[PDB]
Design a protein around this ligand. Structure first.
Ligand code: CA
Ligand code: CL
Length: 123
């Protein structure tokens, strides 16, 4: 769920408030993703969205009736490392992995302020 993704990002980037810093960024970091990513961070978000799309295709996910952002899963942050729990069932585990990959991606790319609150006209 979104709550967990927020926590994962903070796990990798302790100084951030993910919901504010990574929302409304580029063409893909937010609720609406379209066009060509503007930078590597935006591409992290595009990959994350494509990961969620793949999840929705899996037979194991057609039984949640709970949006992937409200769909809770289990994970831990320890020494700033994310670990998806073995207790997660198929769909939840796939989503956990999508989130973990994106959080790690976020922490490894530059953050370009000029891309925050990007006017969607160039998306
Ligand atoms: Ca367009
Ligand atoms: Cl990690």
């Amino acid at each position: 769920a979104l709550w967990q993704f927020n926590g994962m990002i903070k796990c990798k980037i302790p100084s951030s408030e993910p919901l504010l810093d990574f929302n409304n960024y580029g063409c893909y970091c937010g609720l609406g993703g379209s066009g060509t990513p503007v930078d590597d961070l935006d591409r992290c978000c595009q990959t994350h969205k494509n990961c969620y799309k793949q999840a929705k295709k899996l037979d194991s996910c057609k039984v949640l009736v709970d949006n992937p952002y409200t769909n809770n899963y289990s994970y831990s942050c320890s020494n700033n490392e994310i670990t998806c729990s073995s207790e997660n069932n198929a769909c939840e585990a796939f989503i956990c992995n999508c989130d973990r990959n994106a959080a790690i991606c976020f922490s490894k790319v530059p953050y370009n302020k000029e891309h925050k609150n990007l006017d969607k006209k160039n998306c």
